[PDB]
C-alpha cells in the first residue's frame, strides 16, 4: 500500500474487477488460496436457497501485457464479512487498496 495516498485507492481497486468483493455479507466458512466460501447471513438470504457464496480466485494467469494476474484472499477463516467487502486482492492491490 502507499504510505502516502489520496484516498482514491479503494475506489480504484474495487471498481476494477481485479478483487473479489463480497456480494452478500456473511461469515467466511472456508478460505483457501484458490477459493473463498461465505456462509451468507440469514438477513441477506432469499427463501429457498443454500445461502452460500463461492468465490473462485484467479491464480497466475497472464494479462495482455504478459504480467501475472493472481488473486490472494484477504479474509481469514471464520471472519465476518459485510456486503461490498474485499475478500481477495487482485494484482497490485493490498487489502482492497490499490498498491502500484
Amino acid at each position: 500500500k502507499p504510505l502516502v495516498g489520496t484516498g482514491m485507492e479503494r475506489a480504484v481497486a474495487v471498481d476494477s474487477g481485479v478483487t473479489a468483493v463480497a456480494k452478500r455479507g456473511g461469515v467466511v466458512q472456508y478460505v483457501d488460496a484458490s477459493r473463498i466460501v461465505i456462509k451468507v447471513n440469514e438477513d441477506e438470504m432469499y427463501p429457498g436457497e443454500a445461502g452460500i457464496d463461492i468465490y473462485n480466485l484467479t491464480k497466475y494467469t497472464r494479462s495482455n501485457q504478459n504480467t501475472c494476474i493472481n488473486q490472494m484472499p484477504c479474509v481469514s477463516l471464520g471472519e465476518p464479512v459485510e456486503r461490498g467487502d474485499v475478500l481477495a486482492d487482485g494484482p497490485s492491490t493490498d487489502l482492497g487498496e490499490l498498491a502500484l
Binding site: 502507499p2 504510505l3 502516502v4 504480467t67 502500484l100
Partner: protein, 50 residues
C-alpha cells in the same frame, strides 16, 4: 500538519537528517532529505529492450 506529524513520531520537522557515508563513515556535510517515496517499476524492463 506534516511537521506536526513528524513531531509526533519524534523526527526532525525539517525532514532532513544527518547521514553518513557507508564507504568512509564520515558525515555528508549537510542534512539530507530522507523519507519514504512510493516507487513504481514500469514495464520498460531492460530484458525486453536489450
Amino acid at each position: 500538519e506534516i511537521k506536526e506529524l513528524l513531531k509526533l513520531g519524534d523526527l526532525p520537522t525539517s525532514g532532513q537528517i544527518r547521514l553518513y557515508d557507508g564507504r568512509t563513515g564520515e558525515q555528508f556535510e549537510r542534512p539530507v532529505t530522507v523519507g519514504y517515496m512510493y516507487m513504481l517499476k514500469l514495464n520498460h524492463l531492460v530484458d525486453d529492450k536489450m
